[PDB]
Amino acid sequence: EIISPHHYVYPNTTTLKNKYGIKNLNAFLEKCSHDTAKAMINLREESLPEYFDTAYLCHIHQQLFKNTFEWAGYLRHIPFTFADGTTAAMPEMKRTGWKNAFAIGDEIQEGLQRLDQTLAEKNNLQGLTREEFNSEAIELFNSLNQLHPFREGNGRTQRLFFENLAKAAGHQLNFSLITKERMMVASVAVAENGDLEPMQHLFEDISNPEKIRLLKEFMHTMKNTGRNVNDRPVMVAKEGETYTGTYRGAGLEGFALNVKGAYIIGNIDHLPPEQLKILKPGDKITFTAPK
Ligand SMILES: [Mg+2]
Ligand code: NI
Ligand code: NI
């Protein structure tokens, strides 16, 4: 057909059409990675907007991908004619039938107008306590996650939309402290079971100053190690829960565990004073977060 999803990609390849003219998937992904990283640095310096609507969501995407994709600012239900003449649009997405699916066609527009409508009615979530703000933000975040409004680049732009919404509303949501894996599990939990607990946990860790300082400390230790924790879920221990694993070493404010490929982080003062004395790296330890 004239308007086809196949028109997003170079023929015979799996690699999206790009402003660089690169057809090798790996080469393209490296160039994109480099360019979008520069865009973030500048985007994080621009002033906050007055309105947080989809126009702003689009501005972000447009600014991030201006040098990579011709359709940078564009939502995926709106037919887009490339410079080369072909016209593309992906209303569907097509998961496997058994997977939970994103919104189709005009649902994208219904959903997004709704998101704009609620943020306007609630003055961008502005006069609220942290629990009030986090509760409202989680609905909107989950909501926007199921719309998957752009063909690609949803994650980064969604993350920066909310980091900025929070900042404007007098709160924090440092998404840079969340790995790609943790976001994946939290999103999957909500889309499959309707389970909010992982996300609540995620936002809690990202907004509570007492837990943000714990993560900042840990993420620092990764700097110049050669490693990449993006593969690995990094969390602050939930209050009440019990974690068991192997000791990864302490700091001033907090320590780290390894529980089946995941880093759990705890306040140093929650350890029994007498354990801390004789506890070396690699020691098996059970820990329970207090009230
Ligand atoms: Mg991606
Ligand atoms: Ni065609
Ligand atoms: Ni460069």
UniProtKB/Swiss-Prot annotation:
Please write the reaction equations for the catalytic activity of this protein. L-tyrosyl-[protein] + ATP = O-(5'-adenylyl)-L-tyrosyl-[protein] + diphosphate; L-threonyl-[protein] + ATP = 3-O-(5'-adenylyl)-L-threonyl-[protein] + diphosphate
List cellular component terms (GO). Answer: extracellular region
Top-rank taxon of the source lineage equals Bacteria
Where located?
Secreted
Alphabetically ordered keywords of this record: ATP-binding, Nucleotide-binding, Nucleotidyltransferase, Secreted, Transferase, Virulence
The record's GO molecular-function terms, alphabetically, read:
AMPylase activity; ATP binding
Chief location: secreted
Q: Which biological processes are named by the entry's GO terms?
A: protein adenylylation; regulation of cell division; symbiont-mediated suppression of host apoptosis
Residues annotated for ATP binding in this entry: F82, A83, R95, T96, E152, G153, N154, G155, R156, R159
Could you tell me which residue ranges the Fido domain spans? 52-205
Top enzyme category: transferase
EC number(s) from the headed UniProt entry: 2.7.7.108
Comment, domains: The fido domain mediates the adenylyltransferase activity.
**Function text:** Adenylyltransferase involved in virulence by mediating the addition of adenosine 5'-monophosphate (AMP) to specific residue of host target proteins.
Name-wise, this protein is Protein adenylyltransferase
In its UniProt entry, the species of origin is given as Bartonella henselae (strain ATCC 49882 / DSM 28221 / CCUG 30454 / Houston 1) (Rochalimaea henselae)
Gene from which the chain derives: bepA
